Design a protein around this nucleic acid. Structure first.
Lengths: 153, 394
RNA sequence: AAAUACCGGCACGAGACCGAUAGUCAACAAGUACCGUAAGGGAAAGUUGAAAAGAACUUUGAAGAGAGAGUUCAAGAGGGCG
RNA sequence: GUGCGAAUCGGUCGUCCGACCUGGGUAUAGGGGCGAAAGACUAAUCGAACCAUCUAGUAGCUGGUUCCCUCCAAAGUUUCCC
RNA sequence: UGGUAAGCAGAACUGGCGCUGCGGGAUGAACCGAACGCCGGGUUAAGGCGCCCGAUGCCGACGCUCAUCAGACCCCAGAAAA
RNA sequence: CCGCCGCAGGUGCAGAUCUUGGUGGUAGUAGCAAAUAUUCAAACGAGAACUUUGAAGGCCGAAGUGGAGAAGGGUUCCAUG
RNA sequence: CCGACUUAGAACUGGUGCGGACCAGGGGAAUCCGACUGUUUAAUUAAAACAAAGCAUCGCGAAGGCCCGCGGCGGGUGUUG
RNA sequence: CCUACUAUCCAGCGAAACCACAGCCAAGGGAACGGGCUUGGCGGAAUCAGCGGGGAAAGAAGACCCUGUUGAGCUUGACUC
RNA sequence: CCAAGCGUUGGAUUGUUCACCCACUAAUAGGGAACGUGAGCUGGGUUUAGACCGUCGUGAGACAGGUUAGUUUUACCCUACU
RNA sequence: CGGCCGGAAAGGGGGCCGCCCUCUCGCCCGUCACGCACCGCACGUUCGUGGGGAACCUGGCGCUAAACCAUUCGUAGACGAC
């Protein structure tokens, strides 16, 4: 593996990663942007509220048609969703990350999400059948996720 | 080519931004023009629409076919408990308009008024006007309060007074009182501000402001109808039945080549909940509140001079979707603007009234207090009992 | 008979030719897969590394997947990988 | 009407013992068949099916026609021509 | 020359645009000035010089005209009899 | 793998509704609406609006959404994972 | 002694409702066209178009009339008259 | 005015046509109907539901008309068989 | 003459624009906006393919003659407007 | 230096007196000598205790709040908003 950003020093950081993860890229990039400037215990509490529909994720770049909610005003925005599977997929990663921290001998009550990045994975093809004997693509849009934590206050 | 047959427009372009009015309380856009000839008075009031009922009276207008006969008129009851004055606000006449000069508030403000300066009253600490109210308990604090007045009869020209509602008394859910700037019209600025300070922290009933047979103007936001279509909103012609995509719309929204859609073409959007100002609403009578003398509560508000019976203006089952009218009320002619319970700004007339219809004198024979929660028959509980005899419950 | 002709067939030798969208349709399980009732039509598709030395073991998870170790000049070559 | 569908669905309709409806077997083949006749049907193809070859058919007509610098630089007029 | 006339159809002569930028005409294939290698100084043409906008911010000259539709620059962009 | 002197050409792309492959914006959008209808508990399980068992409420209503064949399909049959 | 389905009539009765849901023809005076039933452009025309029975001519007594076939002591009508 | 199924908001899943660059107007001139140019109006992030004025919107190298020394189906008193 | 602020209608026959008549009325003035306006409708008229009649043609067919039946697609993009 | 009086069209920093207050200088002619006299040279000299922001000191005086979500309402409502 070769991550995007090296950790500022490799003693205070643990990394976690997952390739070909089958979530919507345009939902996971928005929930991975919301989670970026947080303490890890804040992040686990936050994604739990996104699962139970208690705090929204502000859709900023991929916001085409995305509806308007009352829980996006705390982000200073208009449009928000509660993407369940993206919350579940980079919560499993947070649990793997704080597993790596305990094994690498860190204060796990102090880890801050320094860098988190969601790329596009290779698409997977299947077919929809449309009017007048035509077949159109029905392709899934999976994503690679990588993240680096760092112990602080 | 040209329009084949001439028709008028659908709807007015005078009320054109057909959007939800950002205010819930009716703002007085224009207070009536004053002259220092008259004695000092309030020019507006804040009432609550309770509901509607019949009236029967003998009409005096000579020459007409309704002269010396009886009629039946729709009347609207607006419950109006006495309003409390909490502050005075100065205005100065500027070349850019008319600028607020100096506000001075009273020492004691009731929590019902205080609620207006909060969204989350439960979570709050009620700390508003804790350090302002100090300025009456001190010698040095006084010597700003006293010079804030001397500056306002020297420089300031238009004087308005800050009234609020006694929502404590009203049968609604809400307790958060409505504040309202009411312009003190009448005599000179010294006479006006000496009056307003004496009336500070006191109550003003409706007999002070509005008389009887007085043409007033009612200001209120209309009843909301949500997102309505073009034939629902603008009341255009419906298209005839065989139309493929939809028959409930305007067909052509403009020519080719003024190549944009004009502001005058009838589209779909928000209908109702618009700020409106109907004029010439004749007051028939001002009732009395639920007094307690002798121990015995008197409630014969709707007792006229041709009934003599002890029925309230409350009909059987009170007013539907409002509640029980216990306070002093006003009773105008016909329909007024907005829902049941709706806060309603009653203002004095902008015009002069020199007609027969305007100076007509009212003499109510009968007030209907039959149930409005169905096709009611009985005026009073004693009528229904005397008619229907005893029941199984008895 | 001999001298002449020969894009089929069996075997060879060569080239100022092409170098995997080129050169045969076919460098590979190609007249293959697939399509058409049939006559017929007809593809795509080469490369880890010198050597599998193809990642024991610890650890998180239901698992895909990771984090450390480890092999190699190199995984910034990890099985469709110059 | 980017369909449920390269002709379908709903209501409402025509006929319902006869010139009726229908499965299999069988005969007719491309300037040919078959047609209670619409140039209709002949495998989503019909005023001449489908497949391969002649064949890279011909086009006074459309469209394109790939590096730089310097030097010279036009014509839309005469006569004859299905 | 034909046509009431046409930003119409057809000729002679010379000059242009097409094949050609540049300064002026606010704008514009053809008008007016003038034709171009890459630059500095000077000065002109045709047009300009209230402000946009380089230049009259001259103590410019002499008259004319008041418009409740003033007037204001080749081609040229809206007028007559009276 | 290249310089110089000669030699040879399938020798230079922005366009051809160019060929082949690859990726955008639209867009987390259109949409996932024909034929009445779902619900409470328990089990197995890491995980249940959808599996399975029970209980209820329903539909097909013998020209059936039921039991058997013909043509066509070719292991789709059955058990266990 | 043993009966299985009808039919007609009467009394009383209900808030005049009673083929109570479902099933289930609107009618009349004419004009044009084609007799009628039947058929037709599958995927824009179901019609007054085609057909039709009835009517009327034309050909031929077989080595023949009408038609097929590259060919023939070849073939269809014809197991006909 | 009422009902059902949508549209609408959410979890999960998730295409397509189309697209020089793109996208606010009045007049001027211009291939005589400008989103871009000239002179004026003027110009405030990111967006949701709608709507059908405009993009001389999409669709398909006009099925009308003409030309081509391009054809085909049919006809006959065309020419040659 | 100043003067476009507000009006300028309901019907019989016709696909009609136009026409003409009935009735009402203050009055029943004339026009433009791609001869406003089909992803707004409609499809009566024209103007494909089926058929009938009349005139013309030897015929196939023709009619600026009459007649009847004849598929009206897409917005989820940018702007405009709400 | 503390008070004595004004300022509202976009309040504006000033006028005047006492005393608390300390010189006898300040302005203008003439003597008296001095200061990196930096050896011909460029952004010199100001309004500047400017504007805007991260922070570190050392003193006092002072203050302990509301918004949004979540819940509820139904005068409101596609969703937001209210």
């Amino acid at each position: 593996v070769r991550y995007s950003l090296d950790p500022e020093n490799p003693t205070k950081s643990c990394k976690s990663r997952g390739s070909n993860l089958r979530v919507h890229f345009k939902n996971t990039r928005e929930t991975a942007q919301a989670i970026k400037g947080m303490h890890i215990r804040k992040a686990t509490k936050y994604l739990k509220d996104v699962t139970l529909k208690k705090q929204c994720v502000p859709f900023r770049r991929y916001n085409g048609g995305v509806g308007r909610c009352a829980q996006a005003k705390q982000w200073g925005w208009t449009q928000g969703r509660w993407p369940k599977k993206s919350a579940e997929f980079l919560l499993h990663m947070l649990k793997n990350a704080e597993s790596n921290a305990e094994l690498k001998g860190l204060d796990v009550d102090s880890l801050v999400i320094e860098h988190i990045q969601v790329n596009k994975a290779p698409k997977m093809r299947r077919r929809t059948y449309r009017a007048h004997g035509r077949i159109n693509p029905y392709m899934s849009s999976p994503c690679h996720i990588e993240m680096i934590l760092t112990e602080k206050e | 080519s040209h329009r084949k047959f001439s028709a008028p427009r659908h709807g007015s372009l005078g009320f054109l931004p057909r959007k939800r009015s950002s205010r819930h309380r009716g703002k007085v856009k224009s207070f009536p023009k004053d002259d220092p000839s008259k004695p000092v008075h309030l020019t507006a009031f804040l009432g609550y629409k309770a509901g509607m009922t019949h009236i029967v009276r003998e009409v005096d207008r000579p020459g007409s076919k309704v002269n010396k006969k009886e009629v039946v008129e729709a009347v609207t009851i607006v419950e109006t408990p006495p309003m409390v004055v909490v502050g005075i606000v100065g205005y100065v006449e500027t070349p850019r308009g008319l600028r607020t000069f100096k506000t001075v508030f009273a020492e004691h403000i009731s929590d019902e008024c205080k609620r207006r300066f909060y969204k989350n009253w439960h979570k709050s600490k009620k700390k508003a006007f804790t350090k302002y109210c100090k300025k009456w308990q001190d010698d040095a604090g006084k010597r700003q309060l006293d010079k804030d007045f001397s500056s306002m009869k020297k420089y300031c020209q238009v004087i308005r007074v800050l009234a609020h509602t006694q929502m404590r008394l009203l049968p609604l859910r809400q307790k958060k009182a409505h504040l309202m700037e009411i312009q003190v019209n009448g005599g000179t600025v010294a006479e006006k501000l000496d009056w307003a300070r004496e009336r500070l922290e006191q109550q003003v009933p409706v007999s002070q402001v509005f008389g009887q047979d007085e043409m007033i103007d009612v200001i209120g936001v209309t009843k909301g109808k949500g997102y309505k279509g073009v034939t629902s909103r603008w009341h255009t012609k419906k298209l005839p039945r065989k139309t493929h995509r939809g028959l409930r719309k305007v067909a052509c929204i403009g020519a080719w080549h003024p190549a944009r859609v004009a502001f005058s073409v009838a589209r779909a959007g928000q209908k109702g909940y618009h700020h409106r100002t109907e004029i010439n609403k004749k007051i028939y009578k001002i009732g009395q509140g639920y007094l307690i003398k002798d121990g015995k509560l008197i409630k014969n508000n709707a007792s006229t001079d041709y009934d003599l019976s002890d029925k309230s203006i409350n009909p059987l089952g009170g007013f539907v979707h409002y509640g029980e009218v216990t306070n002093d009320f006003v009773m105008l002619k016909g329909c007024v603007v907005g829902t049941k319970k709706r806060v309603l700004t009653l203002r004095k007339s902008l015009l002069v009234q020199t007609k027969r219809r305007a100076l007509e004198k009212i003499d109510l024979k009968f007030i209907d207090t039959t149930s409005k929660f169905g096709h009611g028959r009985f005026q009073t509980v004693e009528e229904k009992k005397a008619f229907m005899g005893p029941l199984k419950k008895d």
